[PDB]
Design a protein around this ligand. Structure first.
Ligand SMILES: [Mg+2]
Ligand SMILES: [Mg+2]
Ligand SMILES: [Mg+2]
Ligand SMILES: [Mg+2]
Ligand SMILES: [Mg+2]
Ligand SMILES: [Mg+2]
Ligand SMILES: [Mg+2]
Ligand SMILES: [Mg+2]
Ligand SMILES: [Mg+2]
Ligand SMILES: [Mg+2]
Ligand SMILES: [Mg+2]
Ligand SMILES: [Mg+2]
Ligand SMILES: [Mg+2]
Ligand SMILES: [Mg+2]
Ligand SMILES: [Mg+2]
Ligand SMILES: [Mg+2]
Ligand SMILES: [Mg+2]
Ligand SMILES: [Mg+2]
Ligand SMILES: [Mg+2]
Lengths: 63, 55, 143, 141, 63, 206, 145, 56, 70, 54
RNA sequence: UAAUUGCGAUAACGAACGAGACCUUAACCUACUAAAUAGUGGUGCUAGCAUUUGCUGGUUAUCCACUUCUUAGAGGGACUAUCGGUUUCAAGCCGAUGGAAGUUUGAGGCAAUAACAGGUCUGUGAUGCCCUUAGACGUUCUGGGCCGCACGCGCGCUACACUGACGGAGCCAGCGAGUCUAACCUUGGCCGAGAGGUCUUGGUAAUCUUGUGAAACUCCGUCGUGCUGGGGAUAGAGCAUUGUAAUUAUUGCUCUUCAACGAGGAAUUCCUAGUAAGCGCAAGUCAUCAGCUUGCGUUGAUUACGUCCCUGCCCUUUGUACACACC
């Protein structure tokens, strides 16, 4: 499996009608200089590290 | 005690309290001063009682 | 080096004192043993069925040594436990005032506790003698 | 009249008091060596101050501790505190300061609240429920 | 939410308005100042006022 | 280790390992490294302790929950399901019992297998109930590391609590077993199954 | 304790007092399947019969079992406290008995019929299939019969 | 005599209340406004705070 | 009341020839071999400790731990 | 009592075999709560009597 | 921001009620004043084990000293402090250091204007009117009933067990209360399996009950997954206590009888740290009766630290033929 390691850059806001979702931009430690904003589930802060199970796919506002 | 006279409404309870302060001071004195210290220094609000020797 | 009972582990000190009285036979065990229940708050009698009175006596003796004086009611409350009142909630219940009172008798006739002034029972000076003795014997099992 | 200090330590109701005189290294709790306390799963809890600072540092002092109130855990967190607060108070008046500062440093660096008494406390129950915040059950009809 | 009320900020304004030749950046001496210069009824209230005279003094030195 | 014996004697094996490596009950606290990139900074080991019982304030701030010893985090989650609310001294011993069992089979400090079991059952990505209107589909999301550790503890202990229920095996035996099978995912453990089936459902909504 | 190694002497289910008893369960508890003997009563009887509590019902040499019966159906002669027994201070002869397996079903009817036959309220209450001990009957007891 | 200190003060509080009630009913037409009791040796004193003591 | 509340000489020798290769052997471990119930399992743990075969590594009730001889 | 046990149509067995009347599982029946602000007296205090008193 | 709490914008400027302040309680004092009804060290007097000086107790006054612990008086302390992030560098807010304490410090008390045909004439010798008032709707006396049982609903209690029951053993709290013209809280000694009985005793209470030796909990065994030793409904027989009286069984003990219940459908409650939950205890009621309540301490988690999707309510905007105001 293509295990992808990306580090939280910024904490943007709470998505999801419930709110338990947070919008976060990450930078991969393997070949950085590209950033992609991902949706988290658990509580998150700056400089965390998300294990993105698929490299090239991102999302936005949730209902 | 519940504030309500009846039983209607959410069950609001209400605690009253009254504080009792008790002090005792031992003196070794003759017959005069004790009777002079007790006839005066009386106070409306302070219950003063003067017990006698150690038995 | 010197010793007391306070230097010995609380549990296995009694288990040695319990095994002592048995090994001695000077007991005065009432006789309603094996059928008494030691508290209303119990379901079944003690599972030792030959013993458990040496243990209670040894337990009683150690307790009275640790403090100034203890009473019959004081041991009823100490050894008491929680009684399941069937479908109703638990409550603390006192233990049998006859097992303990007859422990205070069978250990006083045996010379480990005397009927103290101020009420209660005091550890007999010969009891300290015997208690500190077998207590030191326990530290010879780990020597 | 020998060099001696006394300290304490309080966990949630229990107050363990400790007299620390100069001695030949004994540590007794209410009557009994520290090698017996027996909740016994927290035996190393009260051993901790003796090890944070080293098995020595006691060969010249005697400690004795009595604990009233509390509970079967409430007191164990008090005695470990009254022990360490005293060892660090004995160097306050009888040894030099820099050694005493080395003790607070080696204690607070690990510090399961060893010199510092925890402020937590049981919160009052308010009417309307069996607990502090817990409310009774309602049914709406 | 430690938003100071107006009675604090009203008193703090009125003190710096007329006691800058006092009232340094140290709350401690400012506290002691208030009990000599101002008539406050509460030790708690006075510490609230002095701590805020101390916030304003700090930033006046700075534009 | 230069022994010393004062009046009230401190035992040898007691004296020995204490002022030496400040290790666990009797297990080495060093050498334990989280076999994965992140969940470090969220798995505690170093700083070491003696038992997994601590009067710590891991609640009155958001992320300070992470600083609790991960072994102690394991215990906390053991003492629950109502009848075991509170009763930490109980689970504290169950952990000590458990670590020896983990130790017995297949060497490797059990405080390291616990790290292995945790990191192997935390879902990397998951799903959530996005409205979309009535017929709510599932949006794939990437669960943060803190939730990856928490859910790993809840999943493991739950898997052992329901398995150890109504059967001759004890809590520590099933707890160890679960941690043992979760060291490297054995596909025969409650936690691995639920972990993979959460990334399975998350994968089918991407 | 010890590792025992007995031969075919031990036997599974054995019958006494008109009921059946599992051989391979402890005898203090194996006796309780007899109606009229419980955990307390059993335990005191075996303590009296010089019987090893750590044994099962499957062991216990046939003399031990025959002794156990003789004590149960005569507790007052073998020094049992007469407040230990299910039926004392009888309502006809005054004597203290301990009714056993099939007899305990017999004495329930004899008592119940004595109350009915007398038309006492407690008996009338029994005849109506109601609760007798005085409990409320509004909210509890809905499935029973 | 021979009272507990707790029951004593509570019993003294009731005595003030009942004493006050009996005056608020009896001395209305005189501007009654309260009482105080001074417990001394040789005497037990009651002061009638009434705006018009000529009628009291 | 199902299989191995009792001693059964063939079961005794079964124990001796089978405790080897048990890296973990305890109350629950003895029951899982289609054999001794928990009561007589807690008796075997002291007899297999009378000499050799099992090494005590744990402490007490509700949790036993033994390991092969060394 | 002699007739109390004699009496048939008595005891659990008889009631247990009869249908449960539907009036058991009823509601509050509420009997006029949404008419609380409409005075049924039909009287209506007058403005002069109010100004005389207030 | 918890807040018409503030900043800022500003035809407004500056103010008051309500919020805040305040008050009570729980936290911090080796600083002040002290205490045989609170406790510590030392000394006598004193017992036990060791001896090489030691270790562990006894002794409401045999004396000396002290106030860390306890107690409550007067003070002190915090002001979200220091520093750094963030933001109109405004109010603020987040992080780190320090601190007894930094969630309005935690928990309460008090709480404006107004509304409701909310509840209470069954708390009142508070009261209008109406009824009744001697064969009484007055009042007292006897007995019964409010507990009555095909069923529907609500708060709970106890459980379905092996993080367990059971038996021994360890042994730790806090809020209270407790008897005068009286029988309240009760130690201790005996008798009793138990419940209890009997003889005495301290206490009008920091002095005596009481260290309330409470319960979970910790410890070593017995049991082995089997409705089993889990569970204790139901029921028979016996003995005690309260009370003038216990039958429809006030309560307590004993043996026996050993049901349903294998974690529970649709639904729905409560809750964010010493909190939840587990656990008992005191007080109220009380002659006897807690499965209730009000408080208390003991053991002590998981998960949020967010949002407006559900729901509930506030805010403007807007419409109105409503103003007895959508009843
Ligand atoms: Mg007990
Ligand atoms: Mg107890
Ligand atoms: Mg039976
Ligand atoms: Mg002081
Ligand atoms: Mg800090
Ligand atoms: Mg109405
Ligand atoms: Mg009224
Ligand atoms: Mg009547
Ligand atoms: Mg009623
Ligand atoms: Mg209610
Ligand atoms: Mg137990
Ligand atoms: Mg008798
Ligand atoms: Mg007297
Ligand atoms: Mg049972
Ligand atoms: Mg059964
Ligand atoms: Mg469930
Ligand atoms: Mg009561
Ligand atoms: Mg009630
Ligand atoms: Mg308009």
């Amino acid at each position: 499996t293509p295990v992808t390691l990306a580090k939280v850059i910024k904490v943007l806001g709470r998505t999801g009608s419930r709110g338990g979702v947070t919008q976060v931009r990450v930078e991969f430690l393997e070949d950085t200089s590209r950033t992609i904003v991902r949706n988290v589930k658990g509580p998150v802060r700056e400089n965390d590290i998300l294990v993105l199970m698929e490299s090239e796919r991102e999302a936005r506002r949730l209902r | 005690t519940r504030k309500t006279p009846n039983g209607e409404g959410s069950k609001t309870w209400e605690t009253y309290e009254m504080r009792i302060h008790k002090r005792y001071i031992d003196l070794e004195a003759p017959v005069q001063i004790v009777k002079r210290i007790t006839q005066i220094t009386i106070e409306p609000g302070v219950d003063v009682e003067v017990v006698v020797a150690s038995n | 080096p010197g010793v007391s009972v306070r230097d010995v582990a609380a549990q296995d000190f009694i288990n040695a004192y319990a095994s002592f009285l048995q090994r001695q036979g000077k007991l005065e065990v009432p006789g309603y043993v094996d059928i008494v229940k030691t508290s209303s708050g119990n379901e079944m009698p003690p599972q030792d069925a030959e013993g458990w009175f040496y243990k209670r006596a040894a337990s009683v003796a150690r307790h009275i040594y640790m403090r100034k004086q203890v009473g019959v009611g004081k041991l009823n409350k100490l050894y008491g436990g929680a009684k399941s009142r069937g479908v109703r909630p638990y409550k603390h219940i006192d233990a049998s005032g006859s097992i303990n009172r007859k422990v205070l008798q069978a250990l006083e006739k045996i010379g480990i506790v005397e009927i103290s002034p101020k009420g209660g029972r005091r550890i007999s000076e010969n009891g300290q003698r015997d208690l500190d003795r077998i207590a030191a014997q326990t530290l010879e099992e780990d020597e | 009249a020998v060099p001696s200090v006394q300290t304490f330590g309080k966990k949630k109701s229990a107050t363990a008091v400790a007299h620390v005189k100069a001695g030949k290294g004994l540590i007794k709790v209410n009557g009994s060596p520290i090698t017996l306390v027996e909740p016994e799963i927290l035996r190393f809890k009260v051993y901790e101050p003796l090890l944070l600072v080293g098995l020595d540092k006691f060969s010249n002092i005697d400690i004795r501790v009595r604990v009233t109130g509390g509970g079967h855990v409430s007191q164990v967190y008090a005695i470990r505190q009254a022990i360490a607060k005293g060892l660090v108070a004995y160097h306050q008046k009888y040894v030099d300061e820099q050694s005493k500062n080395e003790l607070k440093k080696a204690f607070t660096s690990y510090d399961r609240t060893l010199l510092i008494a925890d402020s937590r406390r049981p919160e009052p129950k308010k009417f309307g429920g069996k607990g502090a915040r817990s409310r009774f059950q309602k049914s709406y009809r | 939410g430690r938003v100071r009320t107006k009675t604090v900020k009203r008193a703090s304004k009125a003190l710096i308005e007329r006691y800058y030749p006092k009232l340094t950046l140290d709350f401690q001496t400012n506290k002691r100042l208030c009990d000599e210069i101002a008539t406050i009824q509460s030790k708690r209230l006075r510490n609230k006022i002095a701590g805020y005279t101390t916030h304003l003094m700090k930033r006046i030195q700075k534009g | 280790f230069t022994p010393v014996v004062l009046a009230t004697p401190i035992p040898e094996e007691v004296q020995q390992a204490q002022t030496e490596i400040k290790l666990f009950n009797k297990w080495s606290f060093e050498e334990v490294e989280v076999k994965d990139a992140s969940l470090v900074d969220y798995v505690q080991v170093r700083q070491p302790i003696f038992v997994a019982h601590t009067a710590g304030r891991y609640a009155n701030k958001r992320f300070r929950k992470a600083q609790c010893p991960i072994i102690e985090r394991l215990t906390n989650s053991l003492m629950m399901n109502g009848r075991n609310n509170g009763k930490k001294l109980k689970a504290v011993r169950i952990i000590k019992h458990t670590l020896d069992i983990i130790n017995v089979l297949t060497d490797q400090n059990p405080i390291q297998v616990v790290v292995d079991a945790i990191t192997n059952t935390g879902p990397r990505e998951d799903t959530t109930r996005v409205g979309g209107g009535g017929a709510a589909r599932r949006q794939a999301v990437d669960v943060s590391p803190l939730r990856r550790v928490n859910q790993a503890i809840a999943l493991l202990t739950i898997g052992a609590r329901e398995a150890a229920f109504r059967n001759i095996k004890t809590i520590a035996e099933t707890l160890a077993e679960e941690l043992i099978n979760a060291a490297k995912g054995s596909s025969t453990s409650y936690a691995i199954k639920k972990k993979d089936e959460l990334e399975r459902v998350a994968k089918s909504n991407r | 304790s010890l590792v025992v190694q007995e031969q075919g002497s031990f036997q599974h289910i054995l019958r006494l007092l008109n009921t059946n008893v599992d051989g391979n369960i402890k005898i203090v508890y194996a006796l309780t399947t007899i109606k009229g003997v419980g955990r307390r009563y059993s335990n005191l009887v075996c303590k009296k019969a010089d019987v090893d509590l750590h044994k099962r019902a499957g062991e216990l040499t046939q003399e031990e079992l025959e002794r156990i019966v003789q004590i149960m159906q005569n507790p007052t002669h073998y020094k049992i406290p007469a407040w230990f027994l299910n039926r004392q201070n009888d309502i006809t002869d005054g004597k203290d008995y301990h009714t056993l397996a099939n007899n305990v079903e017999s004495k329930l009817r004899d008592d119940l019929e004595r109350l009915k036959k007398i038309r006492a309220h407690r008996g009338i209450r029994h005849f109506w299939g109601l609760r007798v001990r005085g409990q409320h009957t509004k909210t509890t007891g809905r499935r029973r019969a | 005599a021979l009272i507990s200190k707790k029951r004593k003060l509570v019993a003294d509080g009731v005595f003030y209340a009942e004493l006050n009630e009996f005056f608020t009913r009896e001395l209305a037409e005189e501007g009654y406004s309260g009482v105080e009791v001074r417990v001394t040796p040789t005497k037990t004193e009651v002061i009638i705070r009434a705006t018009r003591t000529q009628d009291v | 009341a199902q299989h191995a509340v009792i001693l059964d000489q063939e079961k005794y020798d079964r124990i001796l020839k089978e405790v080897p290769t048990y890296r973990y052997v305890s109350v629950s471990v003895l029951v899982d071999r289609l054999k001794i119930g928990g009561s007589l399992a807690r008796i075997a743990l002291r007899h297999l400790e009378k000499e050799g075969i099992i090494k005590p590594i744990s402490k007490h009730s509700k949790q036993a731990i033994y390991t092969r001889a060394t | 009592n002699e007739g109390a046990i004699r009496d048939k149509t008595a005891g659990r067995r008889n009631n247990r075999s009869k249908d449960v009347t539907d009036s058991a599982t009823t509601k509050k029946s509420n009997t006029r709560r949404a008419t609380d602000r409409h005075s049924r007296t039909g009287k209506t205090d007058t403005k002069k009597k109010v100004n005389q008193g207030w």
